């Protein structure tokens, strides 16, 4: 007799999804939601190239290690790439205080303009030009200093007078600046470099106070130095004013940065190439429409959510039961 039958669709599909009840279930149609593939290079985000610090670390860049001259001047970046083996950082031994906070503040930027904050003529009656060290060679000069700092020394005949400077911010933009305090290894060096007697370095603004004096002692040799320098940084707010006062041991601000304010700082090896991305992770570019990724949780731009799954496949079709043919 005449037949009518109810039934369902089947196909040559071999893709399986999992289920709470059943593990390896073949279905007619399905959508993978997770991206596991990455491009492996650094690219442009929003058509804004990153900054490659190359052979320099964040410290070497921003203090102006003489060997870091390649990066000197204005910079605009979408993200920063620090290479993990970079050897050009703090050349004259010492601590850069609140370093992590500074690495975080620069990470929060997209642009800096370099400008002379304190001309060397600011400090009267002292030798501004005599003060380089063999710990800070440039590539051409065996004895140099950071391009953003002035190691100030007393004039050919003593003594080191009190020296004073002020800078008024005036502008729209915050200013990032730096200074240091020298700590000779000996009374003898302290006497030679600076006048005899108690020395001080003092700085202040409407909202901030600094005061330090030399801690004289011989520390273990590091790049030929048993002396040390304490480095410091701060941010002059727009409309704020800085006062500087010292009678010795000041490593003075010279040049500073106007700073413009999510950003990232990638420590990585990957090459930076001529391309665009809308999504950049620390281990590669994502070029996907997928919802989840297993490449990395560290990224910038618009990226799919990061999960530790191998696959997230999601069945749209029905259970596939094609009729067998031999």
């Amino acid at each position: 007799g005449d037949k009518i039958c109810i039934g369902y669709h089947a196909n040559n599909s071999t893709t399986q999804v999992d289920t709470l009840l059943e593990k390896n279930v073949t279905v007619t149609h399905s959508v993978e939601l997770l991206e596991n593939q990455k491009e492996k290079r650094f690219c442009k985000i929003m058509n804004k190239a990153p900054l490659d610090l190359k052979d320099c670390t964040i410290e070497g860049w921003i203090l102006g290690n003489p060997k870091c001259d390649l990066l000197l001047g204005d910079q605009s970046w979408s993200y920063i790439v620090e290479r993990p083996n970079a050897q050009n950082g703090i050349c004259y031994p010492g601590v850069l205080n609140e370093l992590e906070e500074l690495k975080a503040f620069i990470g929060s930027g997209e642009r800096v303009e370099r400008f002379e904050m304190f001309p060397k003529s600011t400090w009267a009656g002292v030798d501004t030009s005599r003060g380089v060290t063999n710990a800070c060679p440039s590539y051409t000069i065996d004895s140099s200093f950071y391009r953003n700092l002035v190691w100030i020394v007393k004039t050919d005949s003593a003594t080191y007078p009190v020296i004073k400077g002020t800078y008024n911010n005036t502008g729209t933009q915050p200013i990032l600046y730096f200074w240091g305090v020298h700590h000779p290894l000996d009374t003898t060096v302290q006497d030679n470099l600076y006048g005899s007697g108690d020395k001080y370095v003092r700085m202040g603004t409407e909202s901030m106070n600094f005061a330090k004096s030399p801690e004289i002692a011989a520390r273990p040799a590091v790049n030929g130095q048993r002396s040390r320098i304490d480095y410091y940084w701060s941010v002059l707010r727009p409309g704020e004013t800085l006062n500087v006062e010292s009678n010795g041991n000041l490593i003075a601000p010279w040049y500073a940065y106007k700073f413009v304010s999510k950003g990232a700082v990638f420590k990585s090896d990957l090459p930076i190439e001529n391309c665009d991305a809308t999504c950049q992770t620390i281990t590669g570019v994502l070029r996907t429409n997928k919802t989840f990724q297993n490449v990395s949780p560290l990224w910038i731009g618009e990226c799919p959510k990061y999960v530790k799954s191998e696959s997230l496949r999601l069945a749209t079709g029905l259970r596939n039961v094609p009729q067998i043919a031999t």
Partner: protein
């Protein structure tokens, strides 16, 4: 399968039905074939797509981990930062994975029920004007027109018109 139709009392799918998920196979003196039921296939398609879209939209935020460094005096906050980031990572992987397993269980159920319901729609129309073979098939006790096949499909089967031809045959046997 939970409503029992798919891979159930209907043991297999039709590789020959390519225009829909759910369907009719007819055989009649004028020919035979496989024909998808459009309305129920389309509704299943709207539903399933909405579900995929909804999941996509609900998953459309990201938790961002960070590059921050920590000194050898900042071990406790460094560790706080890691436990936090790994904690949200575990929560979201759980959610993703659990969601998929649960929504796959229920999408297959949904298909099963649409088939079962198509089967009931026809069995209630035909009554004893046809005989239940197994596997979701019905054999008519009466000659069935192409037009008759269409009436059974679109929902307007005329039972009284055939009841006597059917009964004469049913137990003329």
């Amino acid at each position: 399968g939970i409503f029992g139709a798919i891979a159930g009392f209907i043991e297999g799918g039709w590789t020959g039905m390519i225009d829909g998920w759910y369907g009719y196979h007819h055989e009649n003196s004028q020919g035979s074939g496989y024909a998808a039921d459009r309305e129920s296939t389309q509704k299943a398609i709207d539903g399933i797509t909405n579900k995929v879209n909804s999941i996509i939209n609900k998953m459309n935020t990201q938790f961002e981990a960070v590059d921050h460094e920590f000194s050898n005096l900042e071990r406790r906050i460094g560790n706080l930062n890691k436990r936090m980031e790994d904690g949200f990572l575990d929560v979201w992987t759980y959610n993703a994975e659990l969601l998929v397993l649960l929504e796959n269980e229920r999408t297959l159920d949904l298909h099963d029920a649409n088939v079962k319901n198509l089967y009931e729609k026809v069995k209630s129309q035909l009554r004893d004007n046809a005989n239940d073979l197994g596997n979701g098939c019905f054999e008519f006790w009466h000659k069935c027109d192409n037009e008759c096949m269409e009436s059974v499909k679109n929902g307007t089967y005329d039972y009284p018109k055939y009841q006597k031809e059917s009964k004469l045959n049913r137990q003329g046997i």
